[PDB]
Design brief:
Layout lengths: L10 H16 L6 H4 L12 H4 L6 H11 L4 H18 L5 H24 L1
Helix pairs in contact: 1-4, 1-5, 1-6, 4-5, 5-6
This protein binds 4-[(E)-(4-hydroxyphenyl)diazenyl]benzenesulfonic acid.
Length: about 120
């Protein structure tokens, strides 16, 4: 149905789409919060966060791959934000707070970043 992979993808176009999307993530203020900014194991009281989560891919880092073009394609970006949802789903072992923060994100985020990948191409 024309989505994900289609155009040659330039970070300027990609972002045109992947920006409002990552934004839809951010608008979830807390729900996106364990992602937007580095989880901050020093803050959340986490010692081995970068041991548990191999790729927390903060919504700031993802937004960066966007500002710089470290994806060459939108789904690579979604892979990052889903890489994020992962640190949520890998650490919060499905039964924690940020787990709900993410699950909701994935819900909204993609609810926008899906037709976005399509919007994009
Ligand atoms: O900025 S806050 O809204 O105050 C806040 C509060 C708690 C948070 N917890 N983050 C976690 C991340 C991983 C984990 O396994 C457990 C917790 C993160 C942010």
């Amino acid at each position: 149905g024309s989505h994900m992979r289609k155009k040659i993808f330039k970070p300027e176009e990609l972002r045109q789409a992947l920006m409002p999307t990552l934004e839809a993530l951010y608008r979830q203020d807390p729900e996106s919060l364990p992602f937007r900014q580095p989880v901050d194991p020093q803050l959340l009281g986490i010692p081995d966060y970068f041991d548990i989560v191999k790729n927390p891919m903060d919504l700031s880092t993802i937004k960066r791959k966007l500002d710089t073009g470290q994806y060459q394609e939108p789904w690579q970006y979604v892979d990052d934000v889903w890489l994020m949802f992962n640190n949520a789903w890998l650490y919060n072992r499905k039964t924690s707070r940020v787990y709900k923060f993410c699950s909701k994100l994935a819900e909204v985020f993609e609810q926008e970043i899906d037709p976005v990948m399509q919007s994009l191409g």
